[PDB]
Amino acid sequence: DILLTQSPVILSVSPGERVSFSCRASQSIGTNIHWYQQRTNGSPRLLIKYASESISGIPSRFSGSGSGTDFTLSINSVESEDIADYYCQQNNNWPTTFGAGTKLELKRTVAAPSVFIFPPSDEQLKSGTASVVCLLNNFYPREAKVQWKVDNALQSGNSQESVTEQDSKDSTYSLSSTLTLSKADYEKHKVYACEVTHQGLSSPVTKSFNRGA
Amino acid sequence: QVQLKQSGPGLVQPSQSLSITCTVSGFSLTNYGVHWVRQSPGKGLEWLGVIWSGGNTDYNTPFTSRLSINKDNSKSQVFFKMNSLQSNDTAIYYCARALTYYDYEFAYWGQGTLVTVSAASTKGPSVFPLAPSSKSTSGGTAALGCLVKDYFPEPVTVSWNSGALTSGVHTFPAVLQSSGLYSLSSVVTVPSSSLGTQTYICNVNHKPSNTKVDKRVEPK
Amino acid sequence: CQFDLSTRRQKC
Ligand SMILES: *[C@@H]1O[C@H](CO)[C@@H](O)[C@H](O)[C@H]1NC(C)=O
């Protein structure tokens, strides 16, 4: 089967900039190449067919070129809504095969997270488990540290983080840090603190509550 | 409009078979072929096969032994079936239609069906409020959310106020707990002055367990 | 990078 090699693996550009994606084939495939965009939680969307031919409903800023083995998908002025992965597909040789994709990240100005902390609901406490949630909302860039402390003891290994993909409108990330304790352990302690470190903060920001008030 | 709607996501036991139904509209199965493509961590996008207008089928070489595609033209349905699944068959499965009847440029896609191959059991989530307070209200903006905890398998869909509320919503990617069950949170920021007048409900749906929960989230 | 089933996005 034809091997399609996409490079580079990740692209990172600022809005308004031109950007190009490379798709290389293991043997010549004329112009039998199609390109797709995949957004967060989406199905692939067909961008270009046969190397350079346009698709109805696709913005004009998308184009493609190339023939033989070397192919290029281009976006002449990147917008935040372009945050996605991009795939090539060849169909000169059965069976049709896809490349492994290139990721497109957008740069933007530094944005400090807004930090919120949520104690466990009394509902959850009835099940014998306590989740304490810390939210870091709408920040850039992606690197952040969350430090948990219970009664000034460093918490380690009992929390999990999830991070959103880049927002398609404002290019920020959001992060959730969830600290999980048995109801028994939770009731044996008073001060629950989430400490947040980020490039956009001059000092770490701490949000906390006392179990009760 | 041209559309392809797939059957819901779910669990299949290892060495068992997978069945997906693709239902189309805006065109006739007698005029177009329907293709099947999957997407997995290990192998990315793979074309699996196709059923053509007149009923002929082609299967990608490593799948001929365990893949069957059938359809009912009148009912506009295409039926995908794959035998003896193993773990690495865990993937998103899609049906798709080309631009022209004979071609492979996929302009129309189904919404995808997440198939988890696992010996485990389906388990619905519990939904817990992430209540707004003063420790979640700064500069007139309040954060609130829902903790969707202890379900299997993926996916779970979350929406706010029956779809009416989307602005400022963040639904976090699920994370696998040590229990082997998933957990996630979905949050939203709103004007804190609206907490007294507006109701906030996260609508949670875990199709693999047919678990639908609407959780009202109030300031505590 | 690897495709992520949770987000349908490439994870690196
Ligand atoms: C699944 O495993 C088989 C070997 O058991 C391998 O040939 C195949 O490529 C794998 N498929 C994946 C990783 O999607």
Short mmCIF file of N, CA and C in Angstrom, two decimals, chain A residues 1 32 34 36 38 41-46 49-50 55 87 89 91 94-99 115-125 127 129 131 133 135-138 160-165 167 169 172-176 178 180 207-210 212-213, chain B residues 37 39 44-47 58-61 92 94 99 102-112 127-138 141-145 147 149 166-178 183 185 187-189 215 220:
data_model
loop_
_atom_site.label_atom_id
_atom_site.label_comp_id
_atom_site.label_asym_id
_atom_site.label_seq_id
_atom_site.Cartn_x
_atom_site.Cartn_y
_atom_site.Cartn_z
N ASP A 1 0.84 -1.19 0.00
CA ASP A 1 0.00 0.00 0.00
C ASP A 1 0.87 1.25 0.00
N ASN A 32 -3.76 12.41 -7.33
CA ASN A 32 -4.85 11.73 -6.65
C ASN A 32 -4.70 11.82 -5.13
N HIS A 34 -6.44 13.84 -1.59
CA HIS A 34 -7.48 14.66 -0.97
C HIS A 34 -7.05 15.10 0.44
N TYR A 36 -8.21 16.67 4.38
CA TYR A 36 -9.30 16.79 5.33
C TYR A 36 -8.89 17.56 6.57
N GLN A 38 -9.90 17.94 10.67
CA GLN A 38 -10.66 17.39 11.79
C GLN A 38 -10.57 18.29 13.02
N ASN A 41 -13.64 16.81 18.58
CA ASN A 41 -14.88 16.02 18.60
C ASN A 41 -15.63 15.90 17.27
N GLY A 42 -14.94 16.18 16.17
CA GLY A 42 -15.61 16.19 14.88
C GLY A 42 -15.33 14.99 14.00
N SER A 43 -16.05 14.92 12.90
CA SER A 43 -15.74 13.97 11.86
C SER A 43 -14.90 14.73 10.85
N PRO A 44 -14.08 14.02 10.07
CA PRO A 44 -13.31 14.71 9.02
C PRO A 44 -14.20 15.53 8.08
N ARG A 45 -13.70 16.69 7.67
CA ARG A 45 -14.34 17.54 6.67
C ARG A 45 -13.40 17.66 5.45
N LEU A 46 -13.93 17.32 4.27
CA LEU A 46 -13.19 17.36 3.01
C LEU A 46 -12.85 18.79 2.61
N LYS A 49 -9.93 18.34 -3.09
CA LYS A 49 -9.86 17.06 -3.79
C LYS A 49 -8.93 17.16 -5.01
N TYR A 50 -8.26 16.06 -5.32
CA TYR A 50 -7.32 16.02 -6.44
C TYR A 50 -6.30 17.16 -6.38
N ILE A 55 -13.65 22.76 -2.97
CA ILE A 55 -14.82 22.07 -2.47
C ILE A 55 -15.84 23.13 -2.09
N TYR A 87 -5.30 16.03 7.44
CA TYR A 87 -4.90 14.74 6.88
C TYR A 87 -4.92 14.75 5.36
N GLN A 89 -4.99 12.07 1.90
CA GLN A 89 -5.50 10.77 1.49
C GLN A 89 -5.08 10.57 0.04
N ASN A 91 -5.61 8.19 -3.49
CA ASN A 91 -6.44 7.17 -4.11
C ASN A 91 -6.00 6.86 -5.55
N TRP A 94 -5.32 1.33 -5.04
CA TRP A 94 -6.15 0.60 -4.09
C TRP A 94 -5.23 -0.17 -3.14
N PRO A 95 -5.52 -0.12 -1.83
CA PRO A 95 -6.65 0.61 -1.24
C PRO A 95 -6.27 2.05 -0.87
N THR A 96 -7.27 2.92 -0.81
CA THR A 96 -7.03 4.31 -0.42
C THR A 96 -6.43 4.39 0.99
N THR A 97 -5.42 5.23 1.15
CA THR A 97 -4.72 5.32 2.42
C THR A 97 -4.59 6.77 2.88
N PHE A 98 -4.49 6.96 4.19
CA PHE A 98 -4.38 8.30 4.77
C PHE A 98 -3.03 8.51 5.43
N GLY A 99 -2.60 9.76 5.51
CA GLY A 99 -1.43 10.11 6.30
C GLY A 99 -1.77 10.14 7.78
N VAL A 115 -9.14 31.29 38.37
CA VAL A 115 -9.10 30.08 39.19
C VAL A 115 -10.33 30.01 40.07
N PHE A 116 -10.98 28.86 40.08
CA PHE A 116 -12.14 28.65 40.92
C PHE A 116 -11.95 27.31 41.62
N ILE A 117 -12.42 27.20 42.87
CA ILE A 117 -12.33 25.94 43.60
C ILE A 117 -13.71 25.50 44.09
N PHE A 118 -13.97 24.20 44.03
CA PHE A 118 -15.27 23.64 44.37
C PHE A 118 -15.12 22.51 45.38
N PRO A 119 -15.70 22.68 46.57
CA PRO A 119 -15.70 21.57 47.54
C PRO A 119 -16.55 20.42 47.02
N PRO A 120 -16.43 19.23 47.62
CA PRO A 120 -17.34 18.14 47.25
C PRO A 120 -18.77 18.44 47.68
N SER A 121 -19.72 18.08 46.83
CA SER A 121 -21.13 18.19 47.17
C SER A 121 -21.49 17.22 48.29
N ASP A 122 -22.50 17.57 49.09
CA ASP A 122 -22.97 16.66 50.14
C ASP A 122 -23.57 15.41 49.52
N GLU A 123 -24.05 15.54 48.29
CA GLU A 123 -24.54 14.39 47.51
C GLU A 123 -23.45 13.34 47.34
N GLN A 124 -22.29 13.76 46.82
CA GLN A 124 -21.18 12.84 46.59
C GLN A 124 -20.72 12.21 47.90
N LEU A 125 -20.69 13.02 48.96
CA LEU A 125 -20.25 12.56 50.28
C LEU A 125 -21.09 11.40 50.81
N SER A 127 -21.92 8.89 49.09
CA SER A 127 -21.33 7.69 48.49
C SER A 127 -19.97 7.32 49.10
N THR A 129 -17.15 9.10 48.92
CA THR A 129 -16.03 9.64 48.19
C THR A 129 -16.13 11.17 48.10
N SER A 131 -14.65 14.46 45.93
CA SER A 131 -13.86 15.08 44.88
C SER A 131 -13.79 16.57 45.11
N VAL A 133 -12.61 19.98 43.24
CA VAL A 133 -12.26 20.40 41.89
C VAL A 133 -11.67 21.80 41.85
N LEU A 135 -10.59 24.66 39.02
CA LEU A 135 -10.71 25.07 37.62
C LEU A 135 -9.78 26.23 37.30
N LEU A 136 -8.98 26.08 36.24
CA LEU A 136 -8.14 27.15 35.70
C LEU A 136 -8.73 27.49 34.35
N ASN A 137 -9.35 28.65 34.25
CA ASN A 137 -10.18 28.95 33.09
C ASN A 137 -9.55 29.95 32.13
N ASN A 138 -9.57 29.62 30.84
CA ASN A 138 -9.24 30.53 29.73
C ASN A 138 -7.85 31.18 29.89
N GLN A 160 -5.92 14.26 39.49
CA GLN A 160 -5.82 14.08 38.05
C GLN A 160 -6.20 15.37 37.32
N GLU A 161 -5.51 15.62 36.22
CA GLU A 161 -5.75 16.80 35.42
C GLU A 161 -6.34 16.45 34.07
N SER A 162 -7.28 17.27 33.62
CA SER A 162 -7.72 17.24 32.24
C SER A 162 -7.59 18.65 31.67
N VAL A 163 -7.20 18.75 30.41
CA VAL A 163 -7.04 20.03 29.72
C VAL A 163 -7.83 20.02 28.41
N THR A 164 -8.56 21.09 28.13
CA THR A 164 -9.30 21.20 26.88
C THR A 164 -8.35 21.41 25.72
N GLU A 165 -8.85 21.15 24.52
CA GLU A 165 -8.13 21.56 23.33
C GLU A 165 -8.28 23.07 23.18
N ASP A 167 -9.45 26.63 22.37
CA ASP A 167 -10.75 27.17 22.05
C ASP A 167 -10.72 27.74 20.63
N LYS A 169 -12.43 30.08 19.37
CA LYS A 169 -12.71 31.51 19.27
C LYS A 169 -11.58 32.36 19.81
N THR A 172 -7.64 29.97 23.88
CA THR A 172 -7.18 29.65 25.22
C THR A 172 -7.40 28.18 25.57
N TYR A 173 -6.74 27.74 26.63
CA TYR A 173 -7.01 26.44 27.19
C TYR A 173 -7.75 26.64 28.51
N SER A 174 -8.42 25.59 28.97
CA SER A 174 -8.90 25.54 30.35
C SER A 174 -8.45 24.22 30.95
N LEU A 175 -8.29 24.19 32.27
CA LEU A 175 -7.77 22.99 32.93
C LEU A 175 -8.58 22.69 34.18
N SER A 176 -8.79 21.40 34.42
CA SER A 176 -9.41 20.97 35.66
C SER A 176 -8.46 20.06 36.42
N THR A 178 -8.66 17.65 39.65
CA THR A 178 -9.55 17.01 40.61
C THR A 178 -8.78 16.21 41.67
N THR A 180 -8.98 13.65 44.83
CA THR A 180 -9.92 12.63 45.29
C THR A 180 -9.49 11.95 46.59
N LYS A 207 -6.56 29.40 45.77
CA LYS A 207 -7.97 29.40 46.12
C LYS A 207 -8.19 28.30 47.14
N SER A 208 -8.98 28.57 48.18
CA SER A 208 -9.18 27.59 49.24
C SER A 208 -10.50 27.74 49.96
N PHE A 209 -10.89 26.69 50.67
CA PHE A 209 -12.06 26.72 51.52
C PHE A 209 -11.81 25.92 52.77
N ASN A 210 -12.57 26.22 53.82
CA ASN A 210 -12.59 25.40 55.01
C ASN A 210 -13.81 24.50 54.95
N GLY A 212 -16.97 23.18 55.66
CA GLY A 212 -17.96 23.90 56.44
C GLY A 212 -17.99 25.36 56.00
N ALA A 213 -17.33 26.22 56.78
CA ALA A 213 -17.12 27.61 56.38
C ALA A 213 -15.99 28.31 57.17
N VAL B 37 -14.97 3.80 7.23
CA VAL B 37 -13.62 4.20 7.60
C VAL B 37 -13.59 4.17 9.12
N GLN B 39 -11.03 5.02 12.75
CA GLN B 39 -9.95 5.85 13.23
C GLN B 39 -9.57 5.36 14.62
N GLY B 44 -4.49 5.12 13.11
CA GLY B 44 -5.09 6.30 12.52
C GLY B 44 -6.29 6.01 11.62
N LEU B 45 -6.42 6.77 10.54
CA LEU B 45 -7.51 6.56 9.58
C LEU B 45 -7.26 5.34 8.68
N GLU B 46 -8.20 4.41 8.69
CA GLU B 46 -8.16 3.24 7.82
C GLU B 46 -9.45 3.14 7.05
N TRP B 47 -9.34 2.96 5.74
CA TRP B 47 -10.52 2.64 4.95
C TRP B 47 -10.81 1.14 5.12
N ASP B 58 -16.49 -4.30 -1.59
CA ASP B 58 -15.04 -4.43 -1.54
C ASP B 58 -14.61 -4.23 -0.11
N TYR B 59 -13.73 -5.11 0.37
CA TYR B 59 -13.20 -5.00 1.71
C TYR B 59 -11.68 -4.82 1.67
N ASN B 60 -11.17 -3.89 2.48
CA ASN B 60 -9.73 -3.72 2.60
C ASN B 60 -9.10 -5.06 3.00
N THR B 61 -7.95 -5.39 2.38
CA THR B 61 -7.35 -6.73 2.48
C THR B 61 -7.31 -7.36 3.87
N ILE B 92 -13.10 4.78 16.51
CA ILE B 92 -14.29 5.45 16.01
C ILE B 92 -14.58 4.95 14.61
N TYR B 94 -16.85 5.21 11.15
CA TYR B 94 -17.66 6.15 10.40
C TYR B 94 -18.15 5.52 9.11
N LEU B 99 -18.12 12.26 -3.29
CA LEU B 99 -18.74 13.28 -4.15
C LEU B 99 -19.48 12.67 -5.34
N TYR B 102 -18.76 6.77 -8.04
CA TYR B 102 -17.71 5.76 -8.21
C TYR B 102 -16.43 6.09 -7.44
N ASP B 103 -16.40 7.26 -6.81
CA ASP B 103 -15.15 7.83 -6.31
C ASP B 103 -14.94 7.61 -4.81
N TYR B 104 -13.90 8.24 -4.27
CA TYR B 104 -13.45 7.98 -2.91
C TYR B 104 -13.10 9.28 -2.20
N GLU B 105 -13.57 10.40 -2.74
CA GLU B 105 -13.35 11.68 -2.07
C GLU B 105 -14.53 11.97 -1.14
N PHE B 106 -14.29 11.81 0.16
CA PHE B 106 -15.39 11.71 1.12
C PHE B 106 -15.89 13.06 1.63
N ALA B 107 -16.93 13.55 0.97
CA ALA B 107 -17.50 14.86 1.25
C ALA B 107 -18.55 14.80 2.34
N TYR B 108 -19.10 13.62 2.59
CA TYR B 108 -20.15 13.48 3.59
C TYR B 108 -19.83 12.37 4.59
N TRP B 109 -19.84 12.72 5.87
CA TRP B 109 -19.52 11.76 6.93
C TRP B 109 -20.62 11.58 7.95
N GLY B 110 -20.73 10.36 8.48
CA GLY B 110 -21.55 10.11 9.65
C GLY B 110 -20.88 10.71 10.88
N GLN B 111 -21.59 10.75 12.00
CA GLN B 111 -21.07 11.45 13.18
C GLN B 111 -20.05 10.62 13.93
N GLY B 112 -19.78 9.42 13.43
CA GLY B 112 -18.83 8.52 14.06
C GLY B 112 -19.49 7.71 15.17
N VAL B 127 -23.99 12.00 38.61
CA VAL B 127 -23.76 13.40 38.30
C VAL B 127 -23.81 14.23 39.59
N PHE B 128 -22.74 14.97 39.88
CA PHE B 128 -22.69 15.80 41.08
C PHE B 128 -22.52 17.29 40.76
N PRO B 129 -23.22 18.16 41.50
CA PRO B 129 -23.12 19.58 41.20
C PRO B 129 -21.77 20.15 41.59
N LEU B 130 -21.21 20.99 40.73
CA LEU B 130 -20.10 21.85 41.10
C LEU B 130 -20.70 23.23 41.35
N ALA B 131 -21.12 23.46 42.58
CA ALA B 131 -21.91 24.64 42.92
C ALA B 131 -21.09 25.92 42.93
N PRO B 132 -21.67 27.01 42.40
CA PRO B 132 -21.03 28.33 42.46
C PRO B 132 -21.09 28.87 43.87
N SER B 133 -20.08 29.62 44.28
CA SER B 133 -20.14 30.35 45.55
C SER B 133 -19.36 31.65 45.42
N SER B 134 -18.84 32.17 46.53
CA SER B 134 -17.92 33.31 46.47
C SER B 134 -16.49 32.86 46.15
N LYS B 135 -16.18 31.59 46.45
CA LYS B 135 -14.89 30.99 46.10
C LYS B 135 -14.89 30.49 44.66
N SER B 136 -15.95 30.85 43.94
CA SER B 136 -16.04 30.64 42.50
C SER B 136 -16.74 31.81 41.78
N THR B 137 -16.67 33.01 42.39
CA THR B 137 -17.24 34.24 41.81
C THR B 137 -16.31 35.45 41.93
N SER B 138 -15.68 35.83 40.82
CA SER B 138 -14.80 37.00 40.81
C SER B 138 -15.14 38.00 39.69
N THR B 141 -18.40 37.43 37.67
CA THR B 141 -18.52 36.18 36.92
C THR B 141 -18.47 34.96 37.83
N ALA B 142 -19.48 34.11 37.74
CA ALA B 142 -19.51 32.88 38.53
C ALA B 142 -19.19 31.65 37.68
N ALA B 143 -18.42 30.73 38.25
CA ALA B 143 -18.20 29.45 37.60
C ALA B 143 -19.04 28.36 38.26
N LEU B 144 -19.64 27.49 37.46
CA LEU B 144 -20.39 26.37 38.01
C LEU B 144 -20.26 25.20 37.05
N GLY B 145 -20.59 24.00 37.52
CA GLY B 145 -20.41 22.83 36.68
C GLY B 145 -21.05 21.56 37.20
N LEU B 147 -19.98 17.33 37.87
CA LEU B 147 -19.00 16.26 37.90
C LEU B 147 -19.71 15.00 37.42
N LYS B 149 -19.25 11.25 36.99
CA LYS B 149 -18.27 10.38 37.62
C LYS B 149 -18.61 8.89 37.51
N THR B 166 -24.44 27.58 25.62
CA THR B 166 -23.23 27.03 25.00
C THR B 166 -22.04 27.95 25.22
N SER B 167 -22.31 29.24 25.28
CA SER B 167 -21.27 30.23 25.49
C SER B 167 -20.58 30.07 26.86
N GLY B 168 -19.26 29.91 26.84
CA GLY B 168 -18.51 29.84 28.08
C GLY B 168 -18.52 28.45 28.69
N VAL B 169 -19.05 27.48 27.95
CA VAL B 169 -19.03 26.07 28.36
C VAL B 169 -17.70 25.37 28.05
N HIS B 170 -17.18 24.63 29.03
CA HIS B 170 -16.03 23.77 28.79
C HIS B 170 -16.31 22.36 29.30
N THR B 171 -16.35 21.41 28.38
CA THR B 171 -16.49 20.02 28.78
C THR B 171 -15.14 19.34 28.65
N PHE B 172 -14.57 18.96 29.79
CA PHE B 172 -13.21 18.44 29.81
C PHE B 172 -13.12 17.03 29.24
N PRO B 173 -11.98 16.70 28.65
CA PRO B 173 -11.79 15.32 28.22
C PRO B 173 -11.90 14.38 29.43
N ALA B 174 -12.51 13.22 29.23
CA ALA B 174 -12.59 12.21 30.28
C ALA B 174 -11.20 11.73 30.71
N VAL B 175 -11.09 11.30 31.96
CA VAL B 175 -9.87 10.66 32.44
C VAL B 175 -10.19 9.31 33.07
N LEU B 176 -9.32 8.34 32.83
CA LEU B 176 -9.49 7.00 33.34
C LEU B 176 -8.98 6.96 34.77
N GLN B 177 -9.86 6.65 35.72
CA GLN B 177 -9.46 6.49 37.11
C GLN B 177 -8.84 5.11 37.33
N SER B 178 -8.23 4.90 38.48
CA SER B 178 -7.55 3.64 38.77
C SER B 178 -8.57 2.50 38.80
N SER B 183 -14.18 9.55 34.40
CA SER B 183 -14.75 10.68 35.09
C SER B 183 -14.47 11.94 34.28
N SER B 185 -15.55 16.54 34.16
CA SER B 185 -16.34 17.68 34.56
C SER B 185 -16.66 18.54 33.36
N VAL B 187 -17.94 22.60 32.87
CA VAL B 187 -18.16 23.84 33.59
C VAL B 187 -18.73 24.91 32.68
N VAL B 188 -19.18 26.01 33.27
CA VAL B 188 -19.64 27.14 32.49
C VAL B 188 -19.50 28.37 33.36
N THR B 189 -19.16 29.50 32.75
CA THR B 189 -19.11 30.75 33.48
C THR B 189 -20.32 31.61 33.08
N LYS B 215 -29.09 17.43 35.82
CA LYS B 215 -28.69 17.89 37.14
C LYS B 215 -28.80 19.40 37.25
N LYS B 220 -24.82 26.98 46.68
CA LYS B 220 -25.04 26.41 48.00
C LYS B 220 -24.77 27.44 49.10
#
